Amino acid sequence: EVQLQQSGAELVRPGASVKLSCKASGYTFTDYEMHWVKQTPVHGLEWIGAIDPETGGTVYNQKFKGKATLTADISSTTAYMELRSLTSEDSAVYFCISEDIDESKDYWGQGTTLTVSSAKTTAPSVYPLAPVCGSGSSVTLGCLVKGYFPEPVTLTWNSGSLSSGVHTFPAVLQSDLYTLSSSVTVTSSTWPSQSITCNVAHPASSTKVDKKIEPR
Amino acid sequence: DIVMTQSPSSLAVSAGEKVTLSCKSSQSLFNSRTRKNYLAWYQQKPGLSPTLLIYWASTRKSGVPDRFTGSGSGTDFTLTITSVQAEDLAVYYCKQSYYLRTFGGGTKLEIKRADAAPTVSIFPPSSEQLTSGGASVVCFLNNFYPKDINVKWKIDGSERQNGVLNSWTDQDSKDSTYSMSSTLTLTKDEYERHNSYTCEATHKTSTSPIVKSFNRNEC
């Protein structure tokens, strides 16, 4: 099974550089070209460049020549992309992509969220939101993920086995700290007789927290 | 440096309808050795990597639903979705691979549906948050349509504007509605100075707002 492994988040200071890594597995590493793509809300997807691991040959989007440098280590089947002289303009999600010789198939990493900032990494506080004290057909529970930095967090319910009736709200930024929430709606016959737990991952702090929703 | 342009940048349709997405390249993508147009289409859903739909401009990737059809040659290409499903909401990107790679600017596909009122739920600070010394009051306005909506907080009967952060979900892939969270953030000291906390949702489905309220000292 072909897999491309990228770190969830990197936080680096403005003016510094960073080497993002992309660990490939499940195929013969030198057979496939490796591409890098930047995603921002403003520009959508931008191709950065590609390296041929066999030859070390590279090619670049004109926009990123002299910003990015692509390399690869064959024995560790890992591709790297170095970004230099970082600005807020470089904060973005960065994907690696392996292009199969079979042009019907390409393989994407999960994307590394790079944040160029001087602010400190802050793990979230995760708070269970049970209903107000005081009955209906169904019940809505919440999970409040407050005061983390940098992005992202991922949130599931019951390890992802509870996915219907779920709403997860994009984070907002305030005073260099993000807050996000999620709601889940179930029937009153399922909660609280069955356990419902929200699971929060904050990759930049290696945080993985579980909060069981308990009645007030 | 081949340039790619997509249109429209966004469009909305009801489920069951057809959509045609256009993509133009600054030069021909046709290779006169392999006889291929090196043009591909990708679907990107929120929070996921893009997935390949069509390559060589018309060859549907195995396992891609039949309703997706690519077409075109030279500089002009089309992605057709012959019957839009609720789960097809996404940004669709074209990508040339003739000389280098270049992505188009994308088309965001949104879905139209009947109006629906929000279901409003209010949440006092958790006891965990209070023991940590903070206090956030949360209101969810769930499964409404259209996306426009207004929230008013009242504290002890009087409007509160400071300290509110609002956040809209992406359109639901199953029922095509929107939801919105509204969070009033106070210090614990400020929370304990007041008693009644109210969130009022005004939506085009009713002239009367939908109101949820609680009193702190009834916890």
Residue type at position A12: V
Closest to B113 in 3D by CA, of B36, B54, B58, B172: B172
CB contact under 8 A, B129 and A146: yes
Q: Which residues of A touch B101 (CB under 8 A)?
A: 35, 47, 50
Per DSSP, what are the bridge partners of residue A21? A80
Residue A34, H or E segment: strand A33-40
Is the CB of residue B55 less than 8 Å away from at least one CB of chain A?
A: yes
Tokens coding B2: 């081949």
Q: Can you list the domains of chain B with their CATH numbers? A: 4-112 (2.60.40.10), 119-218 (2.60.40.10)
CB contact under 8 A, A45 and B56: no
Closest to A169 in 3D by CA, of B183, B133, B75: B183
Task: For residue A124, count other CB atoms closer than 10 A to its CB.
Answer: 24
Query: What does the alpha-carbon distance between residue A69 and residue A61 come to, in Å, rounded to a whole number?
Result: 11
Integer CA distances (angstroms), B80 to A58, A213, B73, B106, in order: 34, 45, 15, 14
Is the CB of residue B211 less than 8 Å away from at least one CB of chain A?
A: no
Tell me the HSE value of A119 on the side-chain side, using a 13 A CA sphere.
19
Q: Resolution of this PDB entry, in A?
A: 1.8
- Helix, coil or strand: residue A152: coil
Q: Which residues of B touch A100 (CB under 8 A)?
A: none
B145 secondary structure, DSSP code = B
Nearest to A129 among B1, B123, B166 (CB): B123
Residue B128, H or E segment: helix B127-131
CB contact under 8 A, A105 and B172: no
Q: Which residues of B touch A95 (CB under 8 A)?
A: 49
CB contact under 8 A, B179 and A183: yes
Residue type at position A44: G
Q: What are phi and psi of A125, to 5 degrees?
A: -95, 135
Integer CA distances (angstroms), B17 to B13, B72, B77, B144, in order: 7, 21, 20, 22
Query: What does the alpha-carbon distance between residue B89 and residue B95 come to, in Å, rounded to a whole number?
Result: 19
Q: Can you list the domains of chain A with their CATH numbers? A: 3-116 (2.60.40.10), 125-212 (2.60.40.10)
Region for residue A158 given its phi and psi (left: phi exceeds 0; alpha: psi -120 to 50; beta: otherwise) = left
Q: Which residues of B touch A128 (CB under 8 A)?
A: 126, 128
Tokens coding B133: 């010394």
- Tokens 């008693």 correspond to B195
Residue A161, H or E segment: none
Query: What does the alpha-carbon distance between residue B217 and residue B147 come to, in Å, rounded to a whole number?
Result: 34
Task: For residue A144, count other CB atoms closer than 10 A to its CB.
Answer: 27
Residue type at position A133: C
Check whether the bond before A150 is cis (ω within 30° of 0): yes
Residues 183-202 of B with CB under 8 A from A: 183, 185
CB contact under 8 A, B129 and A109: no
Closest to A106 in 3D by CA, of B25, B1, B27, B41: B41
CB contact under 8 A, A144 and B136: yes
Q: What Rg do the C-alpha atoms of chain A give, in angstroms?
A: 21
CB contact under 8 A, A171 and B183: no
Cα end-to-end span (Å), chain B: 64
Residue B189, H or E segment: helix B188-192
Report the gap between the CA of B73 and the closest CA in chain A (Å).
Answer: 18
Query: What does the alpha-carbon distance between residue A120 and residue A170 come to, in Å, rounded to a whole number?
Result: 21
Residue B73 · residue B102 · CB < 8 Å: no
Residue B98 · residue B60 · CB < 8 Å: no
Query: What does the alpha-carbon distance between residue A123 and residue A146 come to, in Å, rounded to a whole number?
Result: 9
Integer CA distances (angstroms), B91 to B23, B51, B61, B148, in order: 13, 11, 18, 21
Task: For residue A190, count other CB atoms closer than 10 A to its CB.
Answer: 13
Q: Which residues of A touch B169 (CB under 8 A)?
A: 167-170
The burial of B16, by beta-carbon neighbours within 10 Å (0-12 exposed, 13-18 middle, 19 or more buried), is given as exposed
The burial of A41, by beta-carbon neighbours within 10 Å (0-12 exposed, 13-18 middle, 19 or more buried), is given as exposed
Residue A98 · residue A106 · CB < 8 Å: yes
Q: Which residues of B touch A105 (CB under 8 A)?
A: 52, 61
Nearest CA in chain A to B105: A44
